[PDB]
């Protein structure tokens, strides 16, 4: 090891009397080294000091092999060993530092005039064999808890001294760096329970469904194709099919697939003497329930599209020539409002254009959609004219990204031309079903997916998930390009979010 | 020693898989003062406070017999003490007592849950994999077992609650007897426990008595002398009825137990049935005189209609009910004069009357105008015609915050009722419905101004004669404001009131009391 | 054969704490102090307390936590290090007269005790001292660390014993009374024999523990909080409502802004919107704007009453719009604007929804097109300080109202002039803020932890040093003074303020009069 200003820390000497057993662990173990998630740094000749290349709590997290044994046990002790590789030939100049932070300290920005001050160490660029550190452990309890997240010593590692060198006119130069951990001979196991499954450290996964079976979360139809293009506006602000990864839904999205485009509504009908009766819907959740103004802009499964709309309604007829029927009505949803559609208060109107005023009964109506009219890609009238909460618009993306988009195409009145509309959205709907059940726990930013083909195994692209809930890709062309409907969707690691992928 | 040994005992196989634990060696250095514990505690084993559990063959594998968390409420020496100090550590020794009859076969598991383990179902494949022992309900010496103390901390806090090993039972086998006549036997546990050799208190602080531990404990005043808390007159029985619903839903003399009231029930006991409002009279030339009520509550606050059914004390019955007012007269003689009104319930119009909204109507007969102003009075009961015990309406016709209903029973329980029907001729009733109740109003102004902490689910109570001193019956008080009792018998059954009820000690929903 | 004494000293038994031979096993580095902090006795941050006979028995005077902040020199060399263990010692010292008669107690309340309330009753059960009034020699106490944690962290506040005194008999003086006769009392502390930090960490300032100051500017060259105007006076005034409910120049201490206070000066009483122009038949030009903040950034409702910046003051308003036309011979002019913002109810005004109507009577015709356009005030017309339509006619969530001065206390006003249209009365009208801006500014660019209640501020001139009265600066962020006379006072505005030490709600000012 190294010379470190520090004393040594007491491990499982301190935690034997206070907890009941002592486990030991497989002794083949302690004799490998194994990359430690988020333990990859590239430096950059345009790279300035101070920059923070890493840093990362000590825990279980830190060992693929640790962190899966850590469901049976309840708490742990000890310290563990790092190693630092460096990539670099012997015209390198440049120099980092590499610390060591105690638990309990302010969340902020490290300047490169404080960063030495901790017991540290500092590394040249040139350097040939890995360099070895410790990673003791100091708490102020006894033991931790596997299923919290307490407070830990932290290593943080930041450019010191920047990289002078030559550089070809293809590839520029990257110094690489990666991370590699092991526990050291004073880590321990505390109390054997019974395996759960739904622990903290669980790797994200995706259901196997081929996007060509999936479900459309902005209208009840099949998905129809995926593509990816830059003609359309960056930055959208769909109401349906946004969800955290984490399992928190936000707009107005609902759980299941079958909710999104239509109402439930109490009815009241009175027949106008000019184009027709008039039906007024007081909106009501779903499952059945009060529906009361809040951060929602609308009850679930409300349209989010703006456009001349018309549903079925379930008709009911008091005259004696039949009894129930289903007929179309009416409604608006466009700008310029000439309106007083107040979803966002419970109030929606609708009429149908017919003489010979119709008997009517009213019955607490569901709604499905049947087709539309003059589709626009912008938010409907929620309020009279006014403003209500809603999600916030999709972004920011790094340079030379763009947004994937699931594509299906709707039915159309318009008297001009057939070719398409065509809907766009983030997710599918199984997809937000799969998060908003798992409700998993997000690490550091965004997952690296892998978009593989089943059958061949040849890979199509890498795309990267954001945490927000969309997917990005690094593509510099000028025209649309769509991809099969085949491949699964795989994970591969966290990443920061300074990542650049590679291009398509 | 005992009589024919084709008996199980044999205990001795512990051989739990745990090391030693250190106790009060740990503590010492970070504790401002020297404290010890009578030496005489630590020799003989007292009942826990929660030390009653019964099995019977009802019962299905997986249910959960009892569970306790490491403490001082697991000793009623250490559940004193322990208002005087403040944190806790060590060990203890635990004793169970089965004795079932040499008739009965089963099997019971006891484990040791370890800290910080989620809270929930604990099913029946799970509780093996914690350090375990098997006990079977034929034993004969009681079984022991150490509860040891696993934390992090040097010491808990005795107020508030941490996180501490616990001790949970279920039943693994279901219990059968081979017992040929007539009968299955039920099999009753206890519980016992004391201190180990490192059990120790840190520091002194002034006793309070209102304690987080403490203990529930009743009023001694008979049922005799108490007053109704649903209209104002004495109870005059107490009464056991199966063929009677079982669920009402009652929105007076509802209480918990740890304080919070439910539904409309009055702290004082003079509040019920009356109310207080401000009154505007004129005159009909058909029903005579016609005053329009806003309703405000008794002591003067002002009426905002919240997640209340009607302002507190109102009548929670249906029918018609006449009140006695005091009113101002103008014409000269007479001044200040007392008048019967009378209103119904349900005239379903639109008058509803609507007593969620501040609003009441009521009307005397009247062939002649009588000179009256505009007042604030208050209305107090004095007859009723046509009296059925079902909720009335409040709103118009939309739906109102509402107590639960009385419930969920066990099989063959039935609800005990403070009641009383005294015979008489009936003049339009068919359905006689005589006075009733669920609780005094001497017990819930005790429960609302003591503010207990509940433990497990319930109590168990004893109603205990007291010129004779020979017990009764023994009853399930549940926590959320009403009694049962075992009852399987066809009729009526009634009971003295000469009796003052006891708490004996906490109690699982699933026990199953004595027949009576 | 014995002999009982019937007068022994007082003092309190203790059992020794172990300090850092606990925690040595489990700490990366144990680092000691210098020698010599250990024999010398220092005036805490909170260290100012006073007693009255407007007080009753059974009220709590003051209670301190056992930390390092309760030493200057602990203070400052907390913000180098990261833990610490150890116990102190703590000296009181009250100015008590040979005519007052009464007596407290000081008790050392152990940790996880129910933060309730404690009687008389129940005080003298703890490890106590009883003090006198009339003692002339201070009074010490030990505070050992009584704790289930092996080392408290500096950035936690956490629990810790607490020292806590509590008034035991009502102080009455032989006089008749009711007289002003005040007792000061003040509180020294030292660390004990086995205190030392735990971890080295490089020294930030920006920490827990950081003694607050205030910028040295005289109020003549400040800003208003409340209108683009420099400060003209500051004065207090009983004859106005003594509980304003202002929604500008309002911020916690801490740094927590509270209301549509913005951080800088020039964002007050203006604001920024998306304008579309109409004409009419007689009306004249009305423009609809939809308010966005100053920065660009979007406007979303939420628990703010309004867009920061926007005017909380009821009246008609002239303001200067920038404009770009469309027939020739000009491209850009600036035209005056009127503004309905009072409880008029003949318009639709909601600020919170965002959505604005603004008039002119004419000129020819003015055809105008849509534009991003910034409002700032011109002119005020019928002044009446209360806060205008936010809403349409329902309510909004707002800052709540001053509160709750103690009595005989009232508040301290920044008095800045307006720009008036009048055709009666030359009188020209003033606005009262509770702090100027530099005043709100200065704070939320520091994260001060206010550790206490009140804090004691006192007002000097520079050149003569002559201090003109004391004022308590509470937490909530505005100034109160002991004042008892019936007409206005005004103020010399060429001094400044500057801190003295925290104090708790309960302390009694010094009256001030002329
Ligand atoms: C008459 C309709 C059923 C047929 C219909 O109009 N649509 C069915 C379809 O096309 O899928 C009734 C059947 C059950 C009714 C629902 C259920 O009773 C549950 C719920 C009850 C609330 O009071 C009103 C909404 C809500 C949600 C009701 C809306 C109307 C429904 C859906
Ligand atoms: C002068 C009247 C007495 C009237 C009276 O004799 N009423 C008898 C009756 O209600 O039949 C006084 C006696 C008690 C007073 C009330 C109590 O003293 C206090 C109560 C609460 C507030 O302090 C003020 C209102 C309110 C509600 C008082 C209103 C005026 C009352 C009602
Ligand atoms: C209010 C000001 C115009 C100022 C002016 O000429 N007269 C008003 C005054 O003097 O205050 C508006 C007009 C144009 C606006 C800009 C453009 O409309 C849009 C532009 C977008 C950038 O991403 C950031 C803001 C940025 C740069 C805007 C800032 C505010 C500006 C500069």
């Known amino acids: 090891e190294q010379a470190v200003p520090i004393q040594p820390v007491a491990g499982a000497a301190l935690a034997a009397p206070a907890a009941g057993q002592i486990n030991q662990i497989d002794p083949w173990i302690f004799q490998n080294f194994v990359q430690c998630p988020l333990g990859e740094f ?44 460096l990539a670099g ?29 901790f017991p540290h160490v500092m590394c040249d660029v040139r350097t040939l064999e890995p360099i070895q550190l410790p990673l003791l452990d100091v708490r102020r309890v006894l033991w931790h808890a596997t299923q919290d997240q307490e407070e830990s010593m932290r290593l943080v590692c930041m450019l010191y001294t920047p ?38 450290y669980r790797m994200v996964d995706l259901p196997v469904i081929q996007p060509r079976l999936c479900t459309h979360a902005r209208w009840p139809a099949p998905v129809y194709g995926l593509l990816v293009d830059p003609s359309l506006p960056s930055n959208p602000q769909w109401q349906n099919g946004r969800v955290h990864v984490d399992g928190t839904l936000l707009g107005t999205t609902p759980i299941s697939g079958s909710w999104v485009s239509c109402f439930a509504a109490e009815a009241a009908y009175e027949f106008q003497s000019g184009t027709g009766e008039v039906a007024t819907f007081t909106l009501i959740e779903q499952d059945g329930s009060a529906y009361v103004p809040g951060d929602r802009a609308a009850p679930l499964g409300y349209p989010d599209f703006s456009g001349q709309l018309e549903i079925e309604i379930q008709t009911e007829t008091t005259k004696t020539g039949d009894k129930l029927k289903v007929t179309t009505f009416e409604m608006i949803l466009g700008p310029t409002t000439n309106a007083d559609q107040a979803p966002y208060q419970g109030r929606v109107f609708a009429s149908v254009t017919a003489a010979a005023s119709l008997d009517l009964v009213d019955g607490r109506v569901r ?79 965004a997952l690296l997916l892998r978009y593989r083909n089943t059958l061949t195994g040849q890979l199509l692209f890498e795309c990267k998930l954001y945490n927000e809930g969309y997917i990005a890709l690094s593509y510099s062309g000028s025209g649309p390009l769509t991809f099969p409907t085949d491949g ?12 650049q992928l590679a291009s398509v």
């Open 367 to 445: 709604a499905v959609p049947r087709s539309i009219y003059g589709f626009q890609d912008t938010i409907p009238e929620y309020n009279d004219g006014l403003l209500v909460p809603l999600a916030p618009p999709i972004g920011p993306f790094l340079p030379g990204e763009v947004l994937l988009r699931f594509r299906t195409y709707m039915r159309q009145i318009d008297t001009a031309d057939a070719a398409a509309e065509a809907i766009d959205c983030a997710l599918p709907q199984e997809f937000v079903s799969w998060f908003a059940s798992n409700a998993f726990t997000v690490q550091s930013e």
């Open 89 to 117: 030939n012997a015209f390198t100049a440049g120099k980092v530092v590499v610390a060591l932070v105690p638990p309990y300290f302010p969340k902020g920005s490290l300047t490169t005039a404080q960063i030495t001050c």
């Open 42 to 85: 590239s430096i950059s000749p345009r790279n300035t000091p101070g920059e923070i290349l890493f840093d990362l709590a000590l825990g279980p997290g830190l060992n693929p092999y640790l962190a899966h044994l850590s469901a049976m046990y309840t708490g742990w002790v000890g310290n563990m060993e790092v190693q630092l590789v």
């Open 488 to 499: 699964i969707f795989e994970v591969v690691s966290w990443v920061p979010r300074l990542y």
């Open 163 to 200: 990289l002078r060198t030559n550089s070809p006119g293809d590839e520029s130069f990257v110094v690489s760096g990666r991370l590699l951990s092991k526990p050291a001979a004073d880590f321990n196991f505390v109390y054997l329970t019974p395996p759960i499954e739904r622990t903290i």
